[PDB]
Design an enzyme around this catalytic site. Structure first.
Site, PDB file in Angstrom:
ATOM      1  N   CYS A 155      -0.401   8.295  -1.453  1.00 29.03           N
ATOM      2  CA  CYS A 155       0.757   7.741  -0.784  1.00 29.03           C
ATOM      3  C   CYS A 155       2.119   8.109  -1.779  1.00 29.03           C
ATOM      4  CB  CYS A 155       0.742   6.036  -0.985  1.00 29.03           C
ATOM      5  SG  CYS A 155       1.853   5.454   0.508  1.00 29.03           S
ATOM      6  N   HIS A 179       2.749  10.006   1.328  1.00 27.78           N
ATOM      7  CA  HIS A 179       3.320   9.486   2.417  1.00 27.78           C
ATOM      8  C   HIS A 179       4.370  10.225   2.899  1.00 27.78           C
ATOM      9  CE1 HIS A 179       5.062   5.991   4.857  1.00 27.78           C
ATOM     10  NE2 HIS A 179       4.211   5.653   4.620  1.00 27.78           N
TER      11      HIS A 179
HETATM   12  C1  LIG Z   1       2.613   3.644   0.044  1.00 26.92           C
HETATM   13  O1  LIG Z   1       1.635   3.073  -0.569  1.00 26.92           O
HETATM   14  C2  LIG Z   1       3.687   4.217  -0.592  1.00 26.92           C
HETATM   15  O2  LIG Z   1       3.704   4.591  -1.755  1.00 26.92           O
HETATM   16  N1  LIG Z   1       4.806   4.120  -0.090  1.00 26.92           N
HETATM   17  C3  LIG Z   1       6.034   4.525  -0.620  1.00 26.92           C
HETATM   18  C4  LIG Z   1       6.502   5.612  -0.001  1.00 26.92           C
HETATM   19  C5  LIG Z   1       8.057   5.762  -0.102  1.00 26.92           C
HETATM   20  C6  LIG Z   1       9.023   4.956   0.367  1.00 26.92           C
HETATM   21  C7  LIG Z   1      10.223   5.207   0.096  1.00 26.92           C
HETATM   22  C8  LIG Z   1      10.621   6.056  -0.834  1.00 26.92           C
HETATM   23  C9  LIG Z   1       9.581   6.876  -1.467  1.00 26.92           C
HETATM   24  C10 LIG Z   1       8.262   6.815  -1.257  1.00 26.92           C
HETATM   25  C11 LIG Z   1       4.430   3.567   1.217  1.00 26.92           C
HETATM   26  C12 LIG Z   1       5.517   3.054   2.121  1.00 26.92           C
HETATM   27  C13 LIG Z   1       4.741   2.544   3.369  1.00 26.92           C
HETATM   28  C14 LIG Z   1       3.425   1.974   3.382  1.00 26.92           C
HETATM   29  F1  LIG Z   1       3.105   1.672   4.270  1.00 26.92           F
HETATM   30  C15 LIG Z   1       2.689   2.650   2.460  1.00 26.92           C
HETATM   31  C16 LIG Z   1       3.150   3.186   1.348  1.00 26.92           C
END
Ligand SMILES: *[C@@]1(=O)C(=O)N([C][C]C2=[C][C]=[C][C]=[C]2)C2=[C][C]=C(F)[C]=C21
Ligand SMILES: *[C@@]1(=O)C(=O)N([C][C]C2=[C][C]=[C][C]=[C]2)C2=[C][C]=C(F)[C]=C21
Ligand SMILES: [Cl-]
Ligand SMILES: [Cl-]
EC number: 3.1.2.-
Lengths: 187, 187
Positions: free
Chosen positions: B105, B125
């Protein structure tokens, strides 16, 4: 107003089947209470993950009723749910008030133990089928998620996202379920 | 002899991405240590699930090295991993000894922060892609799980089972991964 979920957490619960629904329901804006069957103390799940409940069941019951009562699986967790007079009372109240009851993996066998939702179409983990079907009180399904009115059942860790999203759809609608689903990267 | 996994657990970790790999790896007979970044105390995950680590990171490091070091996601969890000198040292040691590193992620962004596995094909992600790709140090993939040698990455909660089973396959082989998979009721 926000919907409210009670997740009953017993020793030997399948931690994936606990955490996936709690997390997904919170993503959906549901107010979720993780309630420890045995009290307020941390709970040792089936694969040794230790989860700290938000409250004892005794305490969480006093803040009822809930829009859903959720029973995770795990053989030993489900046995503990099955043996509990407190769970019996909670489930009977929920059924009586026409509220949703959701149970996954071996979790549905607690419905049998407490004589809840007889006549429903249900699924379970494949290994829990014979226990669930003892006496033929339900009709068995191999669907990954089965929803027969206010009785919502599912099969295992690998169906936990589908189970959780079915709960979300039931409480908050299809559009919310779709919105919550998309960021999860489900197949 | 059994393989050993270190799962680094920080405040704001995605609890599904923590619990699924821990559980699945234990199913595979891997000895898993859930190690609290901040110490021995319970960790408040992204969706408010509270997990009690098996040990502090400080303590778990002393029992190294591990066959895999696993970095869950969650934006805030990954930031905490990214900011940690202790994680840096662990990851550099692991890379140096040619041991597996697995991250899901936003978790892979900690690899960037600590200059680990540059040149690898990675996934994250979708929302974490731009952060991961800052400076073009990796090559980006939309595969649900990406494994480039000893750098194993995946996308989100919905790819957590695939990620975990890829770890199992890498450590214990395809046959063990298949055996562990079948009872999970995966699609
Ligand atoms: C997931 O576990 C995670 O780390 N996510 C964050 C992704 C991200 C969002 C905004 C800016 C940088 C990175 C994420 C988002 C959504 C989700 F459903 C799981 C995860
Ligand atoms: C699942 O979480 C669960 O409850 N399982 C127990 C099924 C069962 C086994 C033997 C006798 C009665 C019931 C189960 C098994 C395997 C799995 F992967 C998940 C779960
Ligand atoms: Cl079990
Ligand atoms: Cl997040």
């Amino acid at each position: 107003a926000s919907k409210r979920a009670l997740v009953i957490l017993a020793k030997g619960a399948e931690e994936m089947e606990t955490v996936i629904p709690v997390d997904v329901m919170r993503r959906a804006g549901i107010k979720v209470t993780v309630a420890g069957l045995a009290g307020k103390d941390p709970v040792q799940c089936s694969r040794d993950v230790v989860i700290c409940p938000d409250a004892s069941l005794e305490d969480a019951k006093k803040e009822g009723p809930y829009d859903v009562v959720v029973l995770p699986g795990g053989n030993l967790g489900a046995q503990n749910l099955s043996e509990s007079a407190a769970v019996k009372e909670i489930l009977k109240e929920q059924e009586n008030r026409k509220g949703l009851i959701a149970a996954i993996c071996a979790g549905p066998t607690a419905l049998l133990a407490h004589e809840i939702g007889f006549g429903s179409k249900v699924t379970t983990h494949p290994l829990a089928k014979d226990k669930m079907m003892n006496g033929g009180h339900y009709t068995y399904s191999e669907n990954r998620v089965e929803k027969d009115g206010l009785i919502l059942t599912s099969r295992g860790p690998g169906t936990s996202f589908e189970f959780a999203l079915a709960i979300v759809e039931a409480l908050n609608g299809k559009e919310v379920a779709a919105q919550v689903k998309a960021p999860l990267v489900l197949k």
